[PDB]
């Protein structure tokens, strides 16, 4: 503390407060989770309307970078848009120079180096974002990654980014994740988003669900959530 100004200086105990302050900035942002099944990856974001001034379909934090890769960001939104553009640029370069789809580990490493380089110097700040990366491949299966504001990027089966980071993965881990197809995992993510913070601090929220895997034949897109309407007919049964 004090000693907290520039991102290049260290502390007398040896850590960087700029990285820490950038980490707990995303803590105040909205809750965003993710979980994969045996043949796909499902995203889901607790998204909030301000009061009555939104349009339900603006500024969606579920991005879509590649044909099979898209983001599930949380944190500062415009910084996430910029980082999404860098991801799109990198996937375009790989497609240009190698002629096939980008493997997700290599993409995550390049983006992690980009994040890390923006943590290194003093003229720039660390990013205020924390996001997901999901993918599917017929020769690689499902891979679900996770990127902090520092640049430590590695894989999970499940995650949560937001306020209830602990309080979601409390009951994400009691899901029988391997033996289930992702169509069940749709209403699973619905009940997970719906259980946390119904009406307590704020007034209203709204659900989006991104969706990639074997059922989409390698495509990554938002569900037709209105089709089969999995949340609310289960949400009204999940209140008891």
């Amino acid at each position: 503390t004090g000693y907290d100004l520039s991102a290049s200086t260290f502390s007398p105990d040896g850590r960087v407060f700029q990285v820490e302050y950038a980490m707990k900035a995303v803590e105040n942002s909205s809750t965003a989770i993710g979980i994969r099944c045996k043949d796909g990856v499902v995203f889901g974001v607790e998204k909030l309307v301000l009061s009555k001034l939104y349009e339900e379909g603006s500024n969606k934090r579920l991005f879509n970078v590649d044909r099979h890769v898209g983001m599930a960001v949380a944190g500062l939104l415009a910084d996430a848009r910029s980082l999404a553009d860098i991801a799109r640029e990198e996937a375009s370069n790989f497609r240009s120079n190698f002629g096939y789809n980008i493997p997700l580990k290599h993409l995550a490493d390049r983006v992690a180096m980009y994040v890390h380089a923006y943590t290194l110097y003093s003229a720039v700040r660390p990013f205020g974002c924390s996001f997901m990366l999901g993918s599917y491949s017929v020769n690689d299966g499902a891979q679900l990654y996770m990127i902090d504001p520092s640049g430590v990027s590695y894989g999970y089966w499940g995650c949560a980014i937001g306020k209830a980071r602990q309080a979601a993965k409390t009951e994400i881990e009691k899901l029988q994740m391997k033996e289930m197809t992702c169509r069940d995992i749709v209403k699973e993510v619905a009940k997970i988003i719906y259980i946390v913070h119904d009406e307590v601090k704020d007034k209203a929220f709204e659900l989006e669900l991104s969706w990639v895997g074997e059922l989409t034949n390698g495509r990554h897109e938002i569900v037709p959530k209105d089709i089969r309407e999995e949340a609310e007919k289960y949400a009204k049964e999940s209140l008891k």
Partner: peptide
């Protein structure tokens, strides 16, 4: 040490 410096040094 911290992982980001490690992975950058590795690349």
């Amino acid at each position: 040490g911290m992982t980001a410096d490690s992975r950058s040094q590795v690349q």
